[PDB]
């Protein structure tokens, strides 16, 4: 039960967890794209939906790192709605939408 055999099993576990996360994102992305397709009466390829799902998975990485950095900038270990508003600071459009939903 060597160290290299243990490392391989742990990598397999990390890999399959990431894959399950990617699957779950792909599921919801498929659902949203299906609502868009019906509403706009425009079909999406299967490759387009996969590309959107891989993009959404990556975007989470940038959202999470930024949020953590913004919280810590303010000496907080707990991410709050002001950190989330900072993500949307370049787009007045997006900031108003997010600020709206925060008043709930």
């Amino acid at each position: 039960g060597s160290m290299e055999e243990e490392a391989e099993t742990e990598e397999q576990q990390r890999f399959s967890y990431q894959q399950r996360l990617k699957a779950a994102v792909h599921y919801t992305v498929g659902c949203l794209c299906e609502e868009v397709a019906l509403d706009k009466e425009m079909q999406f390829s299967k490759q387009t939906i996969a590309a959107i799902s891989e993009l959404t998975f990556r975007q989470c990485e940038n959202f999470a790192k930024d949020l953590e950095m913004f919280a810590r900038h303010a000496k907080r270990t707990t991410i709050n709605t002001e950190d989330v508003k900072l993500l949307a600071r370049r787009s007045n459009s997006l900031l108003k939408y997010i600020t709206d939903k925060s008043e709930e």
Binding site: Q18, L21, A24, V25, T28, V29, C31, L32, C33, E35, V36, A37, K40, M42, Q43, F44, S45, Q47, T48, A51, I52, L55, T56, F57, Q59, C60, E61, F63, A64, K65, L67, E68, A71, R72, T77, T78, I79, N80, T81, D83, V84, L87, A88, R90, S91, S93, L94, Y97, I98, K101, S102
Partner: protein, 75 residues
């Protein structure tokens, strides 16, 4: 309509935090559930507008790639 589950978004964010003590408030988590939704829908609808501007019959990856750069600059 559909949307991301809170618990999935939490796991996606935690997959990436550098620090184990980092946590996300309940309200902040709900806002990120909405933000990820708007990100996906923006990508899809922009893809639709591009395919239409090209007299295309479906949104292919070739149309999606033209919209992604401005999309990521907005988000």
């Amino acid at each position: 309509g559909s949307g991301f589950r809170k618990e999935l978004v939490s796991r996606l964010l935690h997959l990436h935090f550098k620090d184990d003590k980092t946590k996300v408030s309940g309200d902040a988590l709900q806002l990120m559930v909405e933000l990820l939704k708007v990100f996906v829908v923006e990508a899809a609808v922009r893809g639709v507008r591009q395919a239409q501007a090209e007299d295309a019959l479906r949104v292919d990856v070739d149309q999606l790639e033209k919209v992604l750069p401005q999309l990521l600059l907005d988000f």
